[PDB]
Design a protein around this ligand. Structure first.
Ligand SMILES: Nc1ncnc2c1ncn2[C@@H]1O[C@H](COP(=O)(O)O)[C@@H](O)[C@H]1O
Ligand SMILES: Nc1ncnc2c1ncn2[C@@H]1O[C@H](COP(=O)(O)O)[C@@H](O)[C@H]1O
Ligand SMILES: [Hg+2]
Ligand SMILES: [Hg+2]
Ligand SMILES: [Mg+2]
Ligand SMILES: [Mg+2]
Lengths: 274, 274
């Protein structure tokens, strides 16, 4: 009958997709990882994309009141944001414009006032960048790849991941292609030789990956040892320990190094023009 | 000599990865899409991951002063955040804790005070969820798939994308597998029959995709017409127009529908337990 009282809920609300807030919510939730570990505290997100008129907005907020739930939101229209906290007050519910701070900080620093317009809007909709179209050609490169045509790919790639089977290359490699880097994976396995071309390419784009064994078929141990022999022989390769680390962390490590080198610099950092 | 004066810069700084702020920055930048279109206003992001001690932090802020650049930041340690705005003031530079709002809103609503601890921290590091390990098995499902074994996959999939070649299935399908949905792609092409199994599966998980032709090898036109015949015959399939729309938008549409149906509800929304 009802598809969902208590268990503190968090409403996520946007005139666009919800993904920004979703993120920032998720990141915030790390600050309460410890009580959540026993389900002592316990939460539910609820995403409302495309909340881009007054009528929906009120229905939502009302509903969020009926549910007893905090409203994190992101609305580009200033009056829509005014309305939100007003009508939240009227229903007696908490809220927070998660993005306005960040928009206004930028607006002063650049010295230009906001569009005040969602991405949803009819006007200025559908003109996509040359950045976003590299990410496609990257995403393509990275998935469309086999054991029998590495040699060529290793030269074309931007990042290259060498490692044991049990490291997480495919997710990692895809996550980086999302960011716009062509990645090639090279499994390190006992019995097979690595391609000559792995070593004839630029060695500053190759990254080792390895599991910590702690955190009987312990040939696994052997395969790790074997790997490190290879990594030893190639000292210029960073060698990242991935077990426990999440893809997005490990990805940041790699990109940090990859950029530090790419533009040799006093201060090491990852930069995009706009 | 120098690898980077003017062209208003934005520093992004975090005790973890930078990705949250990166996002929220990027989202904010939509509010100035119009002046940026002519490079009238013009910006540079700079990401500093793992800024998790005082010494780095100061070096960074100093550097950011030397560069003449706004500092958006995300630091879980309260005193590190205090330091940041203090030392920004001392160098005479703008700043903004992009996340604190959102952390504190949650903290009051749940009624628990923050961890005050980065993800980087030695303590409470490396315990990963059952959510994150589905996303892997999804990411795996979605890439590891061919023309000659759809039938089985179509039953196992959570989402299924039917459409013309020129729609963007592979990126979209991967983007959803990142969110933890097993996606199967089914190209609609003139000359080939679709698999019987496409129609014998649950029809509430199939989503059409189509290009608007506007926004001679215009057989392309024919292939589109042909597609709509198929979509006509299957009215229960949503049919999303993807040209101009970004993957993350189109993904939100789909997920909205997919969830609205999955848990039939008064109010339509996407929900995760924690
Ligand atoms: N390219 C863009 N143009 C205009 N507004 C945007 C753009 N990207 C993000 N936004 C806005 O910033 C917020 C981002 O939320 P979301 O779209 O859910 O990630 C929404 O209020 C969007 O309308
Ligand atoms: N699982 C987590 N545990 C503790 N802190 C987190 C977690 N996820 C994100 N954060 C914090 O929230 C901010 C997110 O930034 P980022 O890690 O760059 O996306 C950083 O200050 C992180 O330390
Ligand atoms: Hg409020
Ligand atoms: Hg400041
Ligand atoms: Mg949002
Ligand atoms: Mg961050």
């Amino acid at each position: 009958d009802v598809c969902e009282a208590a268990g503190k809920a968090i409403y996520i609300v946007s005139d666009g997709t919800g993904w920004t807030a979703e993120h920032s919510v998720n990141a915030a939730l790390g600050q309460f990882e410890n009580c959540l570990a026993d389900r002592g505290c316990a939460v539910n997100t609820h995403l409302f994309s495309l909340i881009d008129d007054m009528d929906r907005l009120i229905e939502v907020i009302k509903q969020a009141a009926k549910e007893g739930a905090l409203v994190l939101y992101t609305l580009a229209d200033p009056s829509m944001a005014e309305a939100t906290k007003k009508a939240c007050d009227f229903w007696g519910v908490p809220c927070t414009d998660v993005l306005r701070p960040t928009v206004e900080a930028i607006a002063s620093h650049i010295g230009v006032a906001p569009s005040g317009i969602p991405r949803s809007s009819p006007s200025r909709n559908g003109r996509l960048s040359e950045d976003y179209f590299q990410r496609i050609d990257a995403i393509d490169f990275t998935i469309k790849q086999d054991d029998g045509a590495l040699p060529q790919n290793l030269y074309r790639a931007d990042i290259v991941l060498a490692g044991v089977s049990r490291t997480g290359k495919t997710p990692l490699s895809i996550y980086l292609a999302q960011k716009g880097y062509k990645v090639a994976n090279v499994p390190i396995v006992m019995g097979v030789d690595l391609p000559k071309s792995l070593f004839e390419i630029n060695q500053d784009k190759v990254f080792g990956l390895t599991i910590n064994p702690a955190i009987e078929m312990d040939h696994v141990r052997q395969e790790l040892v074997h790997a490190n022999q290879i990594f030893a022989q190639n000292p210029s390769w960073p060698v990242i320990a991935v077990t426990g680390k999440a893809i997005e962390e490990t990805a940041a490590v790699i990109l940090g190094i990859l950029h530090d080198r790419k533009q040799k610099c006093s201060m090491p950092r990852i930069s995009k023009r706009y």
